[PDB]
Write a protein that binds this ligand. Sequence first.
Ligand code: MED
Ligand code: NA
Lengths: 130, 132
Amino acid sequence: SLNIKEASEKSGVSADTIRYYERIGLIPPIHRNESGVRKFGAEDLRWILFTRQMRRAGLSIEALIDYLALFREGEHTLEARAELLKKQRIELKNRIDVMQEALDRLDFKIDNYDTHLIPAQEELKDFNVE
Amino acid sequence: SLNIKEASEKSGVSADTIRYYERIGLIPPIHRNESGVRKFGAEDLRWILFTRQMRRAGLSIEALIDYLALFREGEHTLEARAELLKKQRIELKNRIDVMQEALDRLDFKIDNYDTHLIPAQEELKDFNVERS
Ligand code: MED
Ligand code: NA
């Protein structure tokens, strides 16, 4: 198993972020060895990586906290977990759709520079009139 | 002409957000009337709308300020403006692709629940009624 410094280097998540994840219930409680120190197993690293990934994708701490809490309650929460993730999925896909509309807008503007504005050496206003 | 209240309503952007965009150079300076109040035209609204959409997509405030600055400088900056947009495009595409990775991960986990874990639980409940 890994100590926290090793877990940080492996996950690309800072040691203090890992401490925070555990304290507020984003990742399961971590084993403490005889000397009082955290020792991280494979499933701990998987929770760390999942948290890092979902947070960077915009899922809130509060949803992720709820999901781990249901997970720790065991099999009687399977249906509530599938539902929670399905709600997060729709929200995420909506965020993706928003971002893609902006990328499409940027692509249109860039095509306009490449195809029209730069060859004419004209601003869009200029060019539109002609 | 629109006033700021009209421009805020039409653009879906708060009046204080509009004032902030002008103040820091995200949108071009707005014409003032004889009273000193702002009067908005169509290109103003087009800039407010572009700014809002781009900021919401995470384009940096500093990139958008540079883009307007180039625009205001004139025709000689056209190539530099396309390069700026192209750089922002790459970075936005990368952000989207990372979000899509996360979505694929949620779908995988959701398929495991709906395909495997829940019907497994359901099958056991049936076994237990049809054995009782
Ligand atoms: C470390 S996240 C694992 C997610 C798990 N609860 C599942 O059933 O797919
Ligand atoms: Na070890």
